[PDB]
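Researcher: Final request for today, and then I'll write up notes for the group meeting. The sequence and the SMILES for OPT follow.
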Amino acid sequence: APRSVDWREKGYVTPVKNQGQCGSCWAFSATGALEGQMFRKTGRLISLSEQNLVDCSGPQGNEGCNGGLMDYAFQYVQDNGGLDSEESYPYEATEESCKYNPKYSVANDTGFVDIPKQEKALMKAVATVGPISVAIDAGHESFLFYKEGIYFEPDCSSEDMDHGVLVVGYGFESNKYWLVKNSWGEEWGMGGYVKMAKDRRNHCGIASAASYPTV
Ligand SMILES: NC(N)NCCC[C@@H](NC(=O)[C@H](CSCc1ccccc1)NC(=O)Cc1ccc(-c2ccccc2)cc1)C(=O)N[C@@H](Cc1ccc(O)cc1)C(=O)NCCc1ccccc1
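Model: Predicted protein-OPT complex:
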């Protein structure tokens, strides 16, 4: 695999979004991954609707602003036969009634792949598939106060992850890190991104729950 990868360079990633005070990170992580896969398949980058996922993927196991999984989101899209665009189905940061409209569907998937729980495997996926959905332990104030540099939290857990984010690449500094897209707005961290310790024994469990939708 390459020494470094940054899918933002090839137009696979939309601008940073903000989930607000709602446990919908799994939804933003899911749309981020689909946005990347739909781009590789059609050459068109279209911001997807997290709200659509929040209001309708309950049957698949998601709990709106109370949490969920990226995989459940992917499963919903497959079951649903589509997913509305961010433009047609705006984000409200609160659970509402399902308002899915197939006429505005701009994305779709035929399932998902769960990556082996190894950083080595996550690297291959990132290098050969595009942005990957992952979960990390972001429950420390060090993460809340993150501004710049390679994020390393000594008290991080590789077992219990509580924040779904998006890996858009990886690299090293002149020391290795994963390029992670968060959904807390562009004012947090590095323009909404965070460089997290890579090859430091699955730091914060970044490779424990990795996956992506198949298009
Ligand atoms: N321990 C487990 N697991 N608990 C479940 C967690 C539920 C849900 N995730 C959240 O609620 C996240 C937790 S972030 C860390 C934090 C921990 C403590 C205090 C405070 C902050 N909240 C947010 O991002 C909200 C948010 C917080 C802060 C600012 C912000 C930004 C700048 C300045 C000031 C404030 C802006 C926005 C969630 O569903 N997370 C998923 C992540 C995941 C994990 C594995 C995976 O494979 C995919 C996704 C999850 O844990 N899912 C497993 C649980 C589940 C399953 C089905 C249905 C419901 C819940």
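Model: Residues 19, 23, 25-26, 61-63, 67-70, 135, 138-139, 160-164, 184, 188, 209 surround OPT (CB under 6 Å). Helices lie at 25-42, 50-56, 70-80, 119-129, 141-144.
Researcher: Thanks, that's everything.
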